[PDB]
Amino acid sequence: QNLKSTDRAVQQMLDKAKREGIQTVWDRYEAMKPQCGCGETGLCCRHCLQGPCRINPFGDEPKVGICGATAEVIVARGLDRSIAAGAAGHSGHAKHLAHTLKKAVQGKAASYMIKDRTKLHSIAKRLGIPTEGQKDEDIALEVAKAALADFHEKDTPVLWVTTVLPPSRVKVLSAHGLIPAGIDHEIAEIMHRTSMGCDADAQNLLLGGLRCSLADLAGCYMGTDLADILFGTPAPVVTESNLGVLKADAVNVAVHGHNPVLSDIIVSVSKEMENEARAAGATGINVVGICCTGNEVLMRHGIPACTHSVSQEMAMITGALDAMILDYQCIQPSVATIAECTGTTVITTMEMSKITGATHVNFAEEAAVENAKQILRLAIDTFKRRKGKPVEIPNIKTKVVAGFSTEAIINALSKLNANDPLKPLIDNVVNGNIRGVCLFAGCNNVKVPQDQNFTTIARKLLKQNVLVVATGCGAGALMRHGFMDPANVDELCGDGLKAVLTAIGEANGLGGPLPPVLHMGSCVDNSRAVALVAALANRLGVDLDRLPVVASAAEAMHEKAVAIGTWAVTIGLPTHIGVLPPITGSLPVTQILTSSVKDITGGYFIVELDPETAADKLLAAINERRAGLGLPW
Amino acid sequence: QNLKSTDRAVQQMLDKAKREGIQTVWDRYEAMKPQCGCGETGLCCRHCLQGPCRINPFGDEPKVGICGATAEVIVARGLDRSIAAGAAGHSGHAKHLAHTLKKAVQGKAASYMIKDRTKLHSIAKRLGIPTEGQKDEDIALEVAKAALADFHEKDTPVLWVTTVLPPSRVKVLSAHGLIPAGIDHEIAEIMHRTSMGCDADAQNLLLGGLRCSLADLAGCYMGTDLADILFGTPAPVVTESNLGVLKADAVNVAVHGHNPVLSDIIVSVSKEMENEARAAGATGINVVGICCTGNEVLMRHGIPACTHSVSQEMAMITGALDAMILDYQCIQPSVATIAECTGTTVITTMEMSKITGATHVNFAEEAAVENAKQILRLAIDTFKRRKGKPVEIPNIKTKVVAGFSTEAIINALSKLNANDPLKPLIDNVVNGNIRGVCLFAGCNNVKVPQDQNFTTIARKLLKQNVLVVATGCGAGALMRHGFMDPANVDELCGDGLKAVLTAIGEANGLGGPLPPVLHMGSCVDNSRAVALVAALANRLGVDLDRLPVVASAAEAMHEKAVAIGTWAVTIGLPTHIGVLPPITGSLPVTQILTSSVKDITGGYFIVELDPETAADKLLAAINERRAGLGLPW
């Protein structure tokens, strides 16, 4: 079971699933081997009904697609479509938040409001909207309008790109025509240009993909902005993670997916429903988190994270998960089938995200509170049905310090320097206490023993004094193995990093260091790390491709992770990916993505499947950046 | 060679290609056999980096994707993405025309203007824009604004759907939530909902696809509207088709692709460049058409159609094709490679559609005339280089009567009834002289002997008195085999159809019938057939799913054809497809698309690979519609 997951709680539930005959994601993976190699390397195209066209990576015919598409055109078109799909996900999430905010301030959805008015005003200022003498409702209306306008062409380019990166970075990108004109505009142009008999030049196609990845960044940054306005900017919190946060005697309710628009309501509403839960024989309602909507409510409310990504089925295998409340993205549709074995009530809430066999509750922001109680009453009912059943919850959980928004990080640092908060961080980079910064992002992947790449790479960077930040299921992986527990700083961190984390923590009244890894939130909250890195660049007066900052999508799965990896490259970062993206069938495309893009954006992909080697390569990229600034390393 | 193409000119050029060693689309197809069956049936998914997930159509494991996605979810997601890609193509084309028109009336592009002011006023009226007391420039500005607004969410749904179908049809579609909210909005939502861990219910997914197909119809109808305003509504024309329209002693210039924004300029500009061509030793510039941009200039100017679709390479094999001017869509990228063997200058003109090895001229509407002369001078240069070379142009061509816009058809019929022009058509349907109407649409496919399905089905419907209309490469197939020559009416048409075609032709001063098949234009001009069918429904006071009208994508290839087939079903038509779409791996999806969608929209797919059987099935669908209206059959 160790070959499947490094998580001990997951290993325990795999044994339970095996002996009960419940098929898991790892069993379905085993049944899929040997997997198709052509697809695995990108050398397959089904973009017209003359296909499928497959090209063998090596040997004899076929060597080109039926229409004449070369290996490099086929690879580049496939990648562009996956970038577009990721952008469509992150941007659909942000779009729903934009409508939610507009409804809130237009009197239509009273469950929603401007919770962070400071953030609302900073956003409108960054965008050029008038704060002085305006009602907040009017300002927010304008912010929601600008958000929605960024999806289509207009007289300005996408503002959630051009106003969030330094002007020098926007200049480099404009010179190559990489600034998106509109988020859904770019998505559609990708789908056009990659369709049969259209763009057939690898470099032309990949430049389009870089631009579409920036549309994805815009949607990430928009999603983070709008959720912070609506639900509050995260500040440091203390909670727990892993399966042991489930409680046999409570109504256990998982919130799962990405969009917190209803799950934030679930959180507050469940608190009111406590006595109804006690009346049913439970101690209360225990809301827990799965995947990114779990990260959202962890970041803002301290909701414990139950599990993540590849291992999400294992929460139900405990037999104690009474409800799983779903919005969209990264939900294994197998949960609907597994629910008949485990008694879990699986509920979908989003019109465009249903699963055959799951109960559907038509969530509307206008009825959110009523929708929540209906869903939670179903969870209470399910708890009743299992009264007296035995459950198997692994008694395994870790302590998690999280809530490090960029505002929270700046405030932590400001306790060492009130009017130049970034200076103590830069000082410690300059003097070597902080070698550099690494962002871990993205998913788990069934092909990688769960969390193995995240923890292996994390351990080696921390020993080398890298400041490590994390989002999404990268944060999930690190949090479930103790990397967000300050009591582990001594074991994990180099001497220089320990001193800095300790200096900041002791200045924030903690009497203990910051945690070894800073949890910056969900997948769209990768945009928080961009805001921190951009503010660092603006403070140093250099572009991002000169900073000792790198990114690692160490166990990437989703098309969203591919989009994120691509805009990290596009804004200038060396970007590790720890799973093979479908590009190895074309050396020209690989050479563009890992070498010659350096001369366009300054960033580049690092494809490395061995986690110890990936750590060496990330350190080398960090150190090259250090030497380029004249620093020691 | 007969197994490859039923076109004798194509067969002759295949022999030339074989003996010169030039590899063709049919050779590349042969090298691809046996093709992957899983892909061919839809049972493959690469929507995340855990894949590819393939399911065998029959037998043992694997039976589900790694994430739990069933065969029916995988099939439905793949189809939805192909519908989205088609919509992205048709809508990108329309979007470029919208910008071209706005530039024209804003004084920025003097090569462009309002050529059809009657059409401009009818469009603004259909949309609710004020004609009275407004400059045409102001009206056109508003029309272009409404066009661009239909790409994103707003207070109205997509007007190029809701204002072009009968209100009863819009009502049926609204009741199922099928009206698009915005063209690129729907494209992106498809890419979201089909990404990993999102929509996982076949019926939910296919309803989304129906709605996205209507976004494709909107883009088709927008493209036709804007091109008619800019370049004139087609009226009946006489020309020729097939390779024999090339002339050894002229500068032969093919316009190839879909968007006529530059090719219409090529047409008029080439006329001015005649003496420069004579000075070079040519008789002049012989502009000819390939694929849909060829259909555009044929419909409006009588430009001869040289060839279409699967056989486009064969035009260059003559050795007489001096330039091939490309915009986007359905261009085999092999033309760039074949050009080094044939001396052809291949020129791309669109920023998002380049081909490695082709000369690129950066067309801008603001410099269109200058761009045209530069491209045409290159064609003159290439003619010079081949002065004295032998060429092999097959002396094979057919006579083509075309230009039957819906306005042209209504005007033809109005010579039999001036103030009720649709009545003579309906009368002859009622009394049986016209059994019904069939629209042939879409591509050639290398898997089908070129034109075999179009002509076989056409021959049997015409003998049964079906009024046959055609667009795109369906029109190309029928025109190259004599189906647009009135001299063939006697051979091809039933007695009832002959009498009607003769009655209309003799009323239009022709002294001869209309041609056996009415050429309604390019692929976006499938929207013309919708306008005719909707006007027929509105005249009879019934919905489209009660009319004896059917559609046949007899040799479908492109994702655009899949979108078109799907919106024909969605507006209510029995819709034949003569190539296997990737759906046979899921019986539930097949059953939805061919049977139970009947209860939603009234239309349905007819999947039939044998052309004689497909003809019987189309006739049966026509006759069922006849009996439902109480008519004899």
Ligand code: SF4
């Ligand atoms: S677009 Fe080209 S390579 Fe792709 S399936 Fe069609 S013929 Fe094959």
Ligand code: SF4
């Ligand atoms: S989305 Fe599901 S079925 Fe598709 S490749 Fe990923 S794991 Fe496989």
Ligand code: FES
């Ligand atoms: S041949 Fe396997 S992915 Fe297409």
Ligand code: FES
């Ligand atoms: S396994 Fe052949 S299309 Fe994927």
Ligand SMILES: [Fe+3]
């Ligand atoms: Fe996740």
Ligand SMILES: [Fe+3]
């Ligand atoms: Fe074509």
